[PDB]
Amino acid sequence: SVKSEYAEAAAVGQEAVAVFNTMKAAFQNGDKEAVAQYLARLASLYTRHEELLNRILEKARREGNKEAVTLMNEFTATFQTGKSIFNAMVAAFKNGDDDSFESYLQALEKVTAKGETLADQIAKAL
Numbered sequence: 001s002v003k004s005e006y007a008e009a010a011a012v013g014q015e016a017v018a019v020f021n022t023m024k025a026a027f028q029n030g031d032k033e034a035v036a037q038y039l040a041r042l043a044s045l046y047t048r049h050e051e052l053l054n055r056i057l058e059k060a061r062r063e064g065n066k067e068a069v070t071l072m073n074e075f076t077a078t079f080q081t082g083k084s085i086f087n088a089m090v091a092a093f094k095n096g097d098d099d100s101f102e103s104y105l106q107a108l109e110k111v112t113a114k115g116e117t118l119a120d121q122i123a124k125a126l
């Protein structure tokens with residue numbers, strides 16, 4: 001069901017949270033080799049999550065589930081904000097700009113925290 005598809009996408013999202021928090025610890029510790037690997041892992045996780053969210057949104061559209069479509073449109077917009085900040089984080093890592101990396105990291109956390117009440121609303125709407 002689209003609802004089990006959303007649970008699967010939610011689990012992929014929680015996996016990125018776990019890896020993100022491990023990566024933050026590695027960044028603080030100056031373990032740059034670990035950070036590089038975690039950032040590759042996060043890029044794959046976000047790419048997979050984005051694709052699952054699109055399939056869920058398209059399915060809700062095909063189902064005429066207008067409330068779910070509204071919430072998913074808002075959610076995928078916020079998701080792209082996270083993605084842009086993530087990509088900027090990766091560039092800051094490549095550039096050796098630890099100040100920007102710190103800034104982007106905090107921002108990604110607040111964008112992710114803010115978007116959680118909406119994430120729970122979608123689960124109920126689908």
Ligand SMILES: NCCc1c[nH]c2ccc(F)cc12
Nearest residue numbers: 097098099100101102103104
């Ligand atoms: N963006 C936070 C403020 C800051 C200024 N300079 C920095 C160098 C490294 C770092 F992790 C953080 C900073």
